[PDB]
Amino acid sequence: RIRHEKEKLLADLDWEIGEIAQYTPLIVDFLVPDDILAMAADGLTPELKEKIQNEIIENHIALMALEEYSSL
Ligand SMILES: [Mg+2]
Question: Which cysteines are joined by disulfide bonds?
C-alpha cells in the first residue's frame, strides 16, 4: 500500500499517469519520501498541493542533477 499511496499522491498532485508509470519503485521512494506522503495524510489540498508539489520537484531536481554529473 505505501508505494501504491505514493503513486496515487503523485497523480493527485497532477503528475501524468503516463510518467508515473515509468518511475521505478526506488525513484518513487526518492521523489516521495515518507515525510512527504505524510503531508497529504489528513488530505489535500488547500495549497498543501502546491507545497508538496514544490517538495517533490526539489527531489526530482536532485535526481536529475545526479544523472547529469555522472555522465559529464
Ligand atoms: Mg519507507
Answer: none
Q: What is the CATH number of domain 1-72?
A: 1.20.120.1590
> From ligand 1's centre to the CA of 34, what distance in Å?
6
Entry resolution in angstroms?
Answer: 2.0
What residue spans define the domains of the chain? 1-72
32 Cα to the center of ligand 1, angstroms: 10
Experimental determination technique: X-ray
Instruction: Kindly give the residue spans of alpha helices, DSSP state H, lying in 15-47.
Output: 17-20, 25-31, 34-39
Ligand 1 mean position, distance from CA 72 (Å): 31
